[PDB]
Design a protein around this ligand. Structure first.
Ligand SMILES: CN1[C@@H]2CC[C@H]1C[C@@H](OC(=O)[C@H](CO)c1ccccc1)C2
Ligand SMILES: O=C(O)CCC(=O)C(=O)O
Ligand SMILES: [Fe+2]
Ligand SMILES: [Sr+2]
Ligand SMILES: [Sr+2]
Length: 324
């Protein structure tokens, strides 16, 4: 592989990462209180769990994976239409909601990944008109998927509210206003020992729902485990923003993606979180002398700039705001 994609020795993935047998798989059609308790335990102990019987149509999940794979099969001449000034966009502020293809790495090497990203909320003609023109059915399918994934995310956030003792709808406001859909394409890699599909990270936002069909996702528990792909499940990743708002009562998910020498992989990640204008702080309702705030209030925009640039540590984004 090109030296551009060679990860530092210490960040390279071990060849035989064991299956995460303790990754919670939570049936959302259990009794209400059982679902609240199981989600609460997973959030406190792991920060990553899967949800099944989640009420999002399996047919729509399959149709969305199909049109996302069809997009990445498009020829160069079509993909160039999403490359501003002839190259992929960077994950940097301002992060626009119009569809673009993105490159990503650490500042230095590149991740073995192409990412299509666009905003999904609120859905209006202006936003959907800025989405991919091809495939023809992308806009129709992903509009429906967007609404359904948001519905499921807001259900999970209200289970989280009951678990924390926050009023229902606590996150149904500026804290969930941005919905970025990242479709990740991992082409086959001639040397998986040297490369990463995605470097180890927290998702910086509030909560992320990840749809996957194939292996490659790994979680840090300095031990890495493999997250079993369940094609009809969503992987729920708690973000660094939720870690801060819960005053570390919940864990954030630290995860990475490894490359494969034989086959490509598409994942669909729905990133829900605050507007860039938001102030982030530990929920005052949960604070006391027994539970003092571990973070001072901060600008999400200021956090965002550090989070997207500084990868010296997983929580480099929030280190400046740590107190007590
Ligand atoms: C693998 N990388 C990680 C996670 C996804 C991908 C791109 C980047 O994450 C984002 O762009 C998200 C979008 O909501 C973001 C942006 C600013 C603040 C909080 C979150 C870093
Ligand atoms: O491809 C995956 O399974 C993970 C994607 C991811 O973590 C991300 O886009 O932030
Ligand atoms: Fe992620
Ligand atoms: Sr180009
Ligand atoms: Sr357009």
């Amino acid at each position: 592989v090109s030296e551009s994609f060679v990860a530092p020795l210490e960040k390279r993935a071990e060849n035989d990462v064991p299956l995460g047998n303790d990754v919670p798989i939570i049936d959302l059609q259990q009794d209400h209180l059982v679902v609240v308790q199981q989600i609460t335990k997973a959030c406190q102990d792991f920060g990553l769990f899967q949800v099944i019987n989640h009420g999002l149509p399996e047919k729509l999940m399959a149709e969305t994976m199909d049109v996302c794979k069809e997009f990445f099969a498009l020829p160069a001449e079509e993909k160039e239409k999403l490359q501003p000034k002839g190259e992929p966009a960077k994950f940097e502020l301002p992060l626009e909601q119009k569809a673009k293809l993105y490159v990503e790495g650490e500042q230095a090497f590149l991740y073995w990944k192409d990412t299509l990203a666009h905003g999904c909320h609120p859905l209006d003609e202006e936003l959907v008109n800025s989405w991919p023109e091809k495939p023809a059915t992308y806009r129709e399918v992903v509009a429906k998927y967007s609404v359904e994934v948001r519905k499921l995310t807001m259900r999970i956030l209200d289970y989280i509210c009951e678990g924390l003792g926050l009023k229902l709808g606590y996150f149904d406001n500026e804290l969930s206003q941005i919905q970025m859909m990242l479709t990740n394409y991992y082409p086959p890699c001639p040397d998986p020992s040297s490369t990463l599909g995605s470097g180890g990270h927290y998702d910086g936002n509030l909560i992320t729902l990840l749809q996957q069909n194939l292996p490659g996702l790994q979680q840090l528990i300095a031990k890495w485990i493999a997250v079993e792909p369940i094609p009809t499940a969503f992987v729920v990743n708690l973000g660094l923003t939720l870690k801060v708002i819960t005053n570390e009562k919940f864990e954030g998910s630290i995860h990475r993606v490894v490359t494969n020498p034989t086959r490509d992989r598409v994942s669909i990640a729905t990133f829900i979180g605050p507007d860039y204008s938001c102030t982030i702080e530990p929920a005052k309702e949960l604070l006391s002398q027994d539970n003092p705030p571990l973070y001072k209030p901060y600008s999400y925009a200021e956090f965002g700039e550090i989070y997207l640039s500084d990868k010296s540590d997983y929580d480099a984004g929030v280190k400046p705001y740590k107190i007590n």
